[PDB]
Amino acid sequence: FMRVERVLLKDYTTLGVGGPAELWTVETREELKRATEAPYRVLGNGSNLLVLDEGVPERVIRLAGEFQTYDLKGWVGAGTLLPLLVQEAARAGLSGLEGLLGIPAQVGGAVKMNAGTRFGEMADALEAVEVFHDGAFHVYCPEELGFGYRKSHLPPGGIVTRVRLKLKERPKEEILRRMAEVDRARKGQPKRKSAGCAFKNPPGQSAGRLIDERGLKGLRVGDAMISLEHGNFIVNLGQARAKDVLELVRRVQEELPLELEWEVWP
Numbered sequence: 001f002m003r004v005e006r007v008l009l010k011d012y013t014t015l016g017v018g019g020p021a022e023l024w025t026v027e028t029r030e031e032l033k034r035a036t037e038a039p040y041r042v043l044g045n046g047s048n049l050l051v052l053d054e055g056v057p058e059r060v061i062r063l064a065g066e067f068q069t070y071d072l073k074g075w076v077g078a079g080t081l082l083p084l085l086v087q088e089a090a091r092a093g094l095s096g097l098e099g100l101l102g103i104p105a106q107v108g109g110a111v112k113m114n115a116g117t118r119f120g121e122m123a124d125a126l127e128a129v130e131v132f133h134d135g136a137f138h139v140y141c142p143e144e145l146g147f148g149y150r151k152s153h154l155p156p157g158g159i160v161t162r163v164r165l166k167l168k169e170r171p172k173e174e175i176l177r178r179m180a181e182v183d184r185a186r187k188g189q190p191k192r193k194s195a196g197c198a199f200k201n202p203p204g205q206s207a208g209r210l211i212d213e214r215g216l217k218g219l220r221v222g223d224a225m226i227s228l229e230h231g232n233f234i235v236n237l238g239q240a241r242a243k244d245v246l247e248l249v250r251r252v253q254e255e256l257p258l259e260l261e262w263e264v265w266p
């Protein structure tokens, strides 16, 4: 008896764009088994997604209920918000998540995208990962999941359902000091409607800095704009269409051989 309803994904992504989808809110292991009986996608916090104006035809699964419960010293549900865990770890005097401050991910999305900063990446903070695939749950170590930059290699159709974190006791004031350095490093970034960095960095470089140097900050298509604050942030000024965002992406790609970090749906 899980909740299934048609929604507009613009309401479920940090960028605030996206057409219609059938949303399945899964609260239990058995409900997950049912929801995955037909073609599906998994939605986390929608912070790395560019959803097109037509939306998607597959069941869109969100993990709630038991998947939002957590114990820092035990299992942590994949539907739990990473920003919550970052603060909870500091409160508990547990170190290991400080380098993940400022990433508005669900745990599952952070695993899929190996979310990280120069200070640490999600793969570093994992001891074990429960993954649902082929109708069953299995437990993996992070070394089995093919992690790289902004990358994982989960089993096909794999849904991350729960993790065990790799944390270490540290004085609370020291954890907070490490977090303050991450905050300082992120000062140049906007906190508006965005899906973070649109483009991946070429290995030697910052895509943001390259966009900046090419003078592309401030360029606009409808309500989609290359941020004046950070060149790699495309922001939604109100009612941008995905069409407008895509057009802006193509405008950048005409000038610079950059690849998207965003996942595009469909």
Ligand SMILES: Cc1cc2nc3c(=O)[nH]c(=O)nc-3n(C[C@H](O)[C@H](O)[C@H](O)COP(=O)(O)OP(=O)(O)OC[C@H]3O[C@@H](n4cnc5c(N)ncnc54)[C@H](O)[C@@H]3O)c2cc1C
Pocket (backbone or CB within 6 Å): 014, 041, 042, 043, 044, 045, 046, 047, 048, 049, 063, 078, 079, 102, 103, 104, 105, 106, 107, 108, 109, 110, 111, 112, 113, 114, 115, 116, 117, 158, 159, 160, 161, 190, 191, 194, 195, 196, 197, 263
């Ligand atoms: C302001 C802002 C700042 C950001 N800063 C950073 C940063 O510093 N570093 C960084 O790496 N990223 C950053 N991001 C990008 C983004 O937060 C990450 O890619 C993050 O890991 C996405 O997680 P999510 O839960 O929002 O996933 P979503 O956007 O919902 O989904 C992304 C992908 O993960 C999949 N997915 C989601 N949940 C699961 C699951 N349970 N099991 C299997 N697959 C799943 C989706 O199907 C999709 O393929 C930022 C984004 C914003 C908006």
Ligand SMILES: C=C(O[C@H]1[C@H](O)[C@@H](CO)O[C@H](OP(=O)(O)OP(=O)(O)OC[C@H]2O[C@@H](n3ccc(=O)[nH]c3=O)[C@H](O)[C@@H]2O)[C@@H]1NC(C)=O)C(=O)O
Pocket (backbone or CB within 6 Å): 116, 117, 118, 119, 185, 186, 188, 189, 195, 196, 197, 198, 199, 200, 201, 205, 206, 207, 208, 209, 211, 212, 229, 230, 231, 232, 261
């Ligand atoms: C925000 C994301 O990740 C971010 C992550 O938060 C930060 C912190 O480690 O470093 C990466 O950005 P980045 O390479 O642009 O790092 P920043 O520190 O923001 O910028 C690097 C340098 O470029 C300069 N800067 C940045 C933007 C700009 O328009 N102009 C410019 O001159 C900054 O002043 C800084 O000296 C990540 N992007 C990738 C692809 O790795 C995301 O993935 O969505």
